[PDB]
């Protein structure tokens, strides 16, 4: 095999930031740690509800 080790975008963070939303209650908390811009929300919730419908794998 191979080697090499790389990241792209924090995948806890997408993930975090998703199941967040599911939860509503607790949105402000991890906005308020994290603060999250809007942007970044407007785009991972675009992708959530793309993978909402079919979520290829």
Do not use: C, F, N, W
């Amino acid at each position: 095999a191979s080697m090499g080790k790389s990241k792209e975008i924090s995948q806890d963070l997408r993930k975090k930031i998703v199941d967040l939303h599911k939860s509503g209650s607790s949105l402000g908390a991890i906005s308020k740690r994290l603060k999250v811009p809007r942007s970044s929300v407007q785009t991972i919730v675009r992708k959530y509800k793309h993978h909402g419908t079919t979520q290829h794998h």
